[PDB]
Write a structure and sequence with these properties.
This is part of a larger assembly, with 7 protein chains of 7 kinds.
Chain C: H1 5-14, E1 66-68
Chain E: H1 2-15, H2 20-28, E1 39-40, E2 46-49, E3 59-62, H3 83-89
Antiparallel strand pairs in E: 1-2, 2-3
Chain F: E1 20-23, H1 30-41, E2 44-48, H2 53-58, E3 69-71, H3 79-84, E4 90-93, H4 112-123, E5 130-132, H5 144-158, E6 164-167, E7 171-172, H6 178-183, E8 193-194, E9 197-198, H7 199-211, E10 220-221, E11 228-229, H8 230-240, H9 246-253, H10 274-281
Parallel strand pairs in F: 1-2, 1-4, 2-3, 4-5, 5-6, 6-10, 7-9
Antiparallel strand pairs in F: 8-11
Helix pairs in contact in F: 1-7
Classes of the chains: A alpha+beta, B alpha+beta, C little secondary structure, D mainly alpha, E alpha+beta, F alpha/beta, G mainly beta.
The complex binds NADPH dihydro-nicotinamide-adenine-dinucleotide phosphate (NDP), iron/sulfur cluster (SF4) (2 copies) and zinc ion (ZN).
Chain lengths: 208, 176, 96, 114, 144, 287, 95
């Protein structure tokens, strides 16, 4: 208990609980889950038709400033009707608190493209388009950054395998570097390590 | 606690403005920079004449990938496959058979020296300390064929020296 | 160094920072190796007779995150935290 | 089932935007075969452009057609700029076989191609 | 005292042994820092450690000609050292290997065959495995 | 037959194919494109070089990981040639120099080289040996080069019966000899028929013959699909290039068809004309 | 203990030496095959059979924390010697 166990502080837990119920009171149009972890960071789980209202609210209003933007990743969870998750990760400058706006989406329907209100979101948005495929309507510039120009597939899905379909080599028949389907030298032997016996008891989902 | 920089003002006294004017029209601070660089000229440079003076090191370097063996005995490995399970680029490849005795042994033990990223995870992981990151770092190889070490390569590379390896392990078996 | 007085005087004159003292050619704190074999102590583990692992069972203490509102006059509007205090100029040679 | 599509409302705007994009590709290819110092006649390049249009012909949904229009527009912009190179344009073609036919006989001699 | 350094500097020219031996190690690469003779070892090579020089120029090795018959007057390689002096020379210790020479092992080569890429003798990769599936041989008797 | 010789799946980049190919020469032109097409096929290629290792260093990495292999050889002895054919499934004679040197004339390369290698190939147990030659190299006049190739054809026909004697016409490509000689001159013209054939049609035919059994012993000759005038060809080369001695006898004299013996379409590979590839390959004009 | 193969190539400690139908011989051209010269099988008969009079004894491997972990072997077979799996060297009991 006292040694080697990272102690939690319930003060931040209670204050973020009050702040979360406050947000769910004042924006009832879009709020679904307001969850607080044990390490006391706020997680607000949101429908993707209030991205512009929630961010235009949470940038201002003088109960929570939150100027700073960070990570946006649309973490691909299958077995859902909506695969991808846009995760905005917002930081204050006056208050020292971190909130995670997790809004959901699918492969095709656009989110509202936050670049009009957070200027940092431009290359983050271009990266999420080039790696996942979440189109951003009413956005100025969608190009490819971090992948090749002759490349397609949105490689950070789960449906894109670890090796590539294309692979380059030089050949002198045409004096240039050409693309061929993959012919590995070793298998990348993947080891089964999902060991049984339920290493955590508090997270048992309800069975049938 | 904050200690900000660049907050002075130009003092309009005659002394300060004629000092800044002398700085401008008389190249004084540039001569100061030349003075600092010549002050490092007349030192003695810390180079080492390389192929005669090798550099310093630690007794915990990660080099050659040797194998060991028991005192007046046979090989120390077992083929317990922990090093293939922990090799973070999976350069280790182990195919194991038992021989005519019954004690378990190997057939094939491979390191890709290309894919080896020299962690020391197979140094920490091996229970009998069979594989040791070797001491020296001189590989300098012409072809790509040579850089795929075999088990007999690693045995003849552990037979090439152990006195180094045994001295370093006895220096540093107490920490790790 | 290990040399005459005129060139050492020109070195001190080209930069008055006492060049013979701190010269970046070390001769003395080459660490005396083959040290005595160090014993690594262990603190609040391996003590017998009380170390029930269920007591310090820190992995199992991770609760699932507590849920507040869903889709499935109250004098309020607190902030997530108190406003952070404005700092101070430090004493260790500030500006100005 | 609440779906907000990208640009169109039905396949009429799909046909409109794809015929505009094909017009752009048709007048953009001879500029590139002048610029990149290629090895390919103009009509061979135009035929493989219309081949790439014909490959995706069995798509019905308006969102997917609009998203293909987006993909083709992005790559046409990156080819009218000089941001791509000769490797990429030759990567669109196939002058490095890949020779394996669709014969069951050749897929019997060459092993294990059902 | 500028002429005293030229007098002191002329002595380590003769401290190597003379002129023709002096010209040998000078035109080999550089070194004129002779004077201590810590250790000689088989294949003729010598080892010097001074305490007036700093960390990195403590210890150095001078190789002999034709140690493996390879005309190594020129083109000295790395790993032309035996391994105990390889422990001594990287400053992995404070003792020469005349303090603890041996080991309790009867398998060490007498040679320390040096770096051998681009030679008549270089390493090759090969599978250390026997037959895979043991292809069947048809019987030798004829029929019909 | 023995394992690790059977084919495996797809082709190229350590996809192992059946052949183990010993290729002579290959530091020049046609052997280099043949090594490239074997590396695209993905087989183990033994190449002996008498020359510097640096030239085969620049034509080296087309093979995959440990696929190609090097050794040394000469045109005097048999021990290095036997060392080259210690274990070889197929072997090709692609040798020749188009100008006489001090140590070797046109004599004794075409005479001395194929005797020894055909002898040790028939002895040391190889299969499907393939020998190149020039088209219409006869006993007829005006070329010591071509009569020596006729002598070599006589020897390779007589000893080692089960060969494939093959001959292309004058071939053109990225490092061609005579087309670069056409671009690099200084000039006059006659009437002389000539068929050129692009180099990759020839090497596709060669590798199809080297993997195809049951068409062996039949000698082949290669066909240019146009077969038109020399002076029109020089006009077309100067037109696409924007500008207005045994070799010169060889190019001026004759290049004819021979309907006796089969060619491209009797093996099944599409011919490519001069004009398309000539627009492709004629760079290096002004600016 | 190399074997006089018809190829003449050195065998290994594992029976993997080639045939006359192997082209890996012709990739060993001019490059001398480095085989292990000191084997692992025959180095047990070089070591004497130790005799420890007790019943169930303990093997470590020549020094603490340098070797194999503690293995407590049994010597109850009247005619078969004990054998540590890690070490490989035998033990006998003295009545
Ligand atoms: N139109 C054409 O180009 C035609 C070509 N051919 C054949 O195609 C091949 C390639 O054509 P090309 O470029 O003109 O010829 P190359 O000279 O380029 O190719 C022959 C290769 O073998 C080497 N070689 C030849 N003779 C000797 C020798 N006596 N000793 C050692 N090495 C030798 C050459 O030089 P090195 O030793 O420096 O490696 C070169 O590596 C040749 O075999 C030629 O006979 C035949 C008919 C028509
Ligand atoms: S971890 Fe050690 S004992 Fe286990 S297989 Fe690897 S080298 Fe052998
Ligand atoms: S040090 Fe090398 S062999 Fe060992 S685990 Fe790391 S990458 Fe693998
Ligand atoms: Zn034991």
């Amino acid at each position: 208990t006292r040694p080697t166990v990272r102690p939690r502080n319930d003060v931040a837990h209670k204050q973020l609980s009050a702040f979360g119920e406050y947000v769910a009171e004042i924006l009832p149009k879009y709020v679904q889950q307001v969850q607080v972890s044990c390490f006391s960071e706020l997680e607000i789980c949101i429908h993707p038709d209030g991205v512009i209202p929630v961010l235009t609210f949470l940038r201002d209003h003088s109960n929570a400033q939150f100027k700073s933007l960070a990570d946006l990743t649309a973490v691909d969870i299958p077995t859902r009707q909506n695969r991808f998750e846009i995760v905005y990760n917002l930081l204050s400058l006056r208050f020292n608190s971190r909130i995670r706006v997790k809004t959901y989406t699918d492969e095709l329907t656009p989110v509202e493209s936050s670049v009009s209100v957070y200027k940092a979101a431009n290359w983050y948005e271009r990266e999420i388009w080039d790696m996942f495929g979440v189109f951003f309507a009413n956005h100025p510039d969608l190009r490819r950054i971090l992948t090749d120009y002759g490349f397609e597939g949105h490689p950070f899905r789960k449906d894109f395998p670890l090796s590539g379909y294309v692979e380059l080599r030089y050949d002198d028949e045409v004096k240039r570097v050409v693309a061929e389907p993959v012919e590995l030298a070793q298998e990348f032997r993947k080891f089964d390590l999902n060991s049984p016996w339920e290493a955590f008891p508090a997270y048992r989902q309800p069975p049938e | 606690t904050y200690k900000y920089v660049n907050l002075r003002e130009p003092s309009m006294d005659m002394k300060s403005v004629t000092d800044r004017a002398a700085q401008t029209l008389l190249w004084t601070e540039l001569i100061r920079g030349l003075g600092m660089t010549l002050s490092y000229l007349f030192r003695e440079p810390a180079t080492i004449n390389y192929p005669f003076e090798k550099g310093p090191l630690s007794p915990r370097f990660r080099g050659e990938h040797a194998l060991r063996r028991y005192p007046s005995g046979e090989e120390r490995c077992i083929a317990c496959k922990l090093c293939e399970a922990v090799c973070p680029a999976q350069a280790i490849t182990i195919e194991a058979e038992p021989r005519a005795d019954g004690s378990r042994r190997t057939t094939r033990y491979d390191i890709d020296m290309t894919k080896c990223i020299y962690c020391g995870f197979c140094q920490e992981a091996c229970p009998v300390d069979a594989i040791v990151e070797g001491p020296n770092f001189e590989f300098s190889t012409e072809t790509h064929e040579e850089l795929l070490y075999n088990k007999e390569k690693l045995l003849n590379n552990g037979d090439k020296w152990e006195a180094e390896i045994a001295a370093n392990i006895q220096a540093d078996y107490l920490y790790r | 160094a290990s040399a005459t007085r005129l060139i050492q005087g020109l070195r001190n004159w080209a930069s008055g920072r006492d060049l013979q003292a701190k010269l970046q050619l070390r001769y003395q704190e080459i660490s005396k190796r083959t040290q005595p074999p160090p014993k690594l102590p262990v603190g609040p583990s391996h003590r017998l007779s009380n170390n029930y692992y269920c007591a310090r069972d820190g992995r199992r203490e991770a609760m699932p995150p507590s849920i507040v509102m869903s889709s499935q006059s109250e004098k309020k509007a607190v902030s997530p935290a108190p406003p952070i205090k404005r700092w101070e100029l430090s004493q260790d040679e500030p500006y100005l | 089932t609440s779906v907000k599509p990208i640009f169109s409302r039905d396949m009429n705007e799909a046909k409109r935007r794809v015929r505009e994009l094909y017009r752009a590709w048709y007048r953009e290819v001879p500029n590139t075969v002048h610029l990149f110092q290629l090895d390919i006649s103009v009509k061979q390049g135009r035929d493989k452009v219309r081949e790439m249009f014909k490959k995706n012909a069995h798509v019905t949904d308006p969102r997917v057609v609009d998203l293909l229009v987006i993909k083709g527009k992005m790559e046409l912009e990156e080819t009218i700029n000089v941001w791509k190179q000769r490797t990429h344009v030759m990567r669109f073609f196939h002058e490095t076989e890949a020779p394996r036919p669709k014969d069951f006989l050749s897929k019997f001699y060459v092993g294990h191609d059902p | 005292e500028l002429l005293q350094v030229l007098k002191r500097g002329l002595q380590q020219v003769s401290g190597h042994g003379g002129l023709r031996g002096y010209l040998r190690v000078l035109f080999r690469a550089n070194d004129v820092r002779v004077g201590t003779l810590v250790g000689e070892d088989k294949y003729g090579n010598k080892y010097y450690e001074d305490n007036k020089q700093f960390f990195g120029r403590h210890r150095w090795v001078i190789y002999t000609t034709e140690m493996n018959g390879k005309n190594t007057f020129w083109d000295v390689d790395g790993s032309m050292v035996p391994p105990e002096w390889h422990r001594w020379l990287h400053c992995m210790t404070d003792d020469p290997p005349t303090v603890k020479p041996p080991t309790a092992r009867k398998f060490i080569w007498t040679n320390h065959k040096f770096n051998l890429s681009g030679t008549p003798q270089q390493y090759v990769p090969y599978s250390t495995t026997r037959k895979k599936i043991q292809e069947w041989v048809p019987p030798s008797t004829p029929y019909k | 037959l023995h394992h690790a010789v059977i084919p495996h799946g797809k082709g190229g980049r350590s996809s192992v194919s059946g052949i183990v190919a010993t290729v002579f020469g290959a530091t020049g032109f046609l052997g280099r494109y043949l090594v490239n097409h074997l590396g695209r096929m993905g087989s183990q290629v033994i190449v002996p070089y008498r020359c510097e290792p640096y030239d085969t260093m620049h034509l080296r990495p087309m093979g995959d990981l440990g696929q190609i292999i090097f050794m040394d050889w000469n045109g005097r002895d048999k021990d290095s040639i036997r060392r080259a054919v210690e274990h070889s499934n197929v072997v090709i004679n692609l040798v020749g120099r188009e100008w006489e040197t001090k140590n070797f004339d046109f004599e004794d390369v075409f005479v001395k080289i194929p005797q020894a290698i055909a002898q040790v190939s028939k002895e040391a147990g190889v299969e499907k040996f393939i020998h190149i030659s020039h088209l219409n190299a006869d006993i007829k006049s005006s070329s010591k080069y071509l009569r020596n190739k006729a002598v070599g054809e006589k020897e390779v026909r007589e000893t080692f019966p089960e060969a494939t004697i093959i001959k292309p016409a004058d071939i053109f490509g990225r490092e061609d000899r005579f087309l670069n000689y056409f671009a690099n001159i200084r000039s006059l013209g006659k009437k002389t028929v000539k068929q050129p054939v692009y180099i990759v049609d020839v090497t596709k035919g060669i590798i199809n013959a080297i993997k195809d059994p049951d068409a062996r012993g039949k000698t082949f000759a290669f066909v240019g699909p146009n077969r038109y005038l020399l002076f029109d060809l020089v006009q077309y080369v100067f037109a696409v290039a924007h500008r207005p001695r045994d070799k010169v006898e060889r190019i001026h004299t004759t290049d004819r068809t021979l309907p006796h013996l089969p060619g491209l379409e009797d093996l099944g590979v599409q011919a490519t004309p001069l004009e398309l590839k000539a627009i492709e390959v004629l760079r290096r004009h002004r600016t | 203990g190399v074997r006089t193969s018809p190829t003449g190539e050195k065998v290994t400690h594992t029976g993997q030496v080639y045939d006359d139908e192997d082209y890996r011989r012709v990739r060993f051209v001019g490059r001398q095959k480095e085989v292990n010269e000191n084997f692992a099988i025959d180095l047990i008969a070089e070591q004497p059979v130790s005799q420890v009079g007790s019943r169930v004894i303990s093997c470590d491997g020549g020094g603490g924390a340098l070797g194999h972990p503690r293995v407590y072997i049994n010597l109850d077979k009247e005619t078969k010697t004990g054998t540590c799996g890690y070490c490989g060297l035998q033990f006998r009991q003295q009545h």
